[PDB]
Design a protein around this ligand. Structure first.
Ligand SMILES: Nc1ncnc2c1ncn2[C@@H]1O[C@H](COP(=O)(O)O)[C@@H](O)[C@H]1O
Ligand code: NI
Length: 316
């Protein structure tokens, strides 16, 4: 939570960079410009998810360009824990995401090609033991069920808490189905750890910086995992963010992927499941500044042509 001069010194110290500016972008981040090059920094409190930087190494090694690589510290490292802590510099990519920038059909093909490399990238048996495995935890559903009961009129509510409690009832049917379906389809999947692949676990329009020309980047590798490829492929046609829902695009994607057979059941299951999770996530939050957003997003999940519909509409 520091300010320019503070940060400006750390970079000059640990990275050797001579930046004159270090704005802040409302774990924190800033756009620290140099005399010639712009950077994107990440200050993260407490040492966490080191189980991320691995994959970036493994991927950069795999020679996948669509992965923004960190900048080296004088110590020749990718970060600057500085006594347990953590700093991460990245060059600055002036580019909007799929929530702003639409992918040209061509670019879609390229997203197909990189998701495939990633899905075909072998994982060091060692690194494989730190990544999480898809076990179909009935956790999430239990968190949403604990909500059926949690809706009662308690004056000690709030203008915002009421609304959610309301809207949730105003859509109880849909939800139970999402839960009950995410429950039934799990009961049709026979875990096959022999097919699990290195999946980016949340690859929606929000995590693809759609640059110019014909260069794109895939980001946020905080929670990569080993699972049925459909874990990622489900986002193609997903509708997350009220985008990536045009069927004519699902084609451009798989043309850069390859037609490797797709288990429509893991695809359906994962589609209801991610919702249940958000409902359980945005949910448990609305029961302090994100509560305003966690409800705006929560409600969009039910708007025309968004994840909830696409989940119930068998368009696979
Ligand atoms: N290297 C970068 N350059 C510019 N913006 C970035 C960079 N990495 C991440 N971002 C921004 O941060 C948002 C969330 O990404 P993440 O910080 O990886 O969760 C993206 O929507 C981008 O707007
Ligand atoms: Ni490189």
């Amino acid at each position: 939570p520091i300010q320019a001069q503070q940060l400006i010194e750390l970079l000059k110290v640990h990275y050797g960079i001579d930046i004159h500016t270090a704005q802040f972008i409302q774990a924190f981040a800033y756009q620290a410009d140099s005399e010639s090059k712009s950077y994107f920094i990440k200050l993260k409190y407490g040492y966490h998810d080191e189980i991320n930087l691995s994959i970036i190494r493994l991927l950069h090694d795999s020679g996948i360009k669509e992965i923004i690589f960190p900048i080296h510290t004088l110590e020749a490292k990718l970060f600057q824990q500085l006594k347990h802590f953590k700093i991460i510099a990245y060059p600055f990519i002036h580019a909007p995401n799929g929530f702003t920038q639409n992918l040209t059909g061509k670019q879609w093909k390229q997203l197909g090609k990189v998701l495939r490399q990633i899905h075909e990238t072998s994982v060091p048996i060692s690194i494989q033991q730190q990544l999480r495995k898809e076990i179909y935890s009935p956790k999430w559903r239990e968190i949403v069920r604990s909500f059926y009961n949690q809706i009662e009129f308690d004056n000690s509510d709030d203008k915002l808490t009421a609304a959610f409690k309301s809207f949730f009832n105003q859509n109880s049917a849909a939800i139970h189905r999402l839960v009950d379906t995410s429950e039934k389809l799990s009961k049709k999947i026979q875990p096959d750890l022999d097919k699990y692949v290195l999946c980016h676990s949340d690859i929606h329009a929000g995590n693809v910086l759609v640059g110019n020309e014909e260069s794109i980047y895939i980001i946020d590798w905080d929670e990569p995992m080993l699972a049925p490829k459909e874990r990622d492929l489900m986002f193609i046609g997903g509708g997350v963010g009220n985008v990536w829902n045009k069927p004519h695009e699902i084609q451009y994607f798989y043309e850069g992927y390859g037609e490797i057979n797709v288990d429509k059941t893991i695809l359906s299951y994962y589609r209801h499941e991610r919702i249940v999770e958000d409902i359980a996530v945005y949910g448990q939050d609305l029961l302090n500044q994100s509560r305003l957003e966690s409800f705006k997003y929560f409600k969009e999940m039910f708007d025309p042509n968004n994840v909830v519909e696409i989940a119930f509409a068998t368009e696979q």
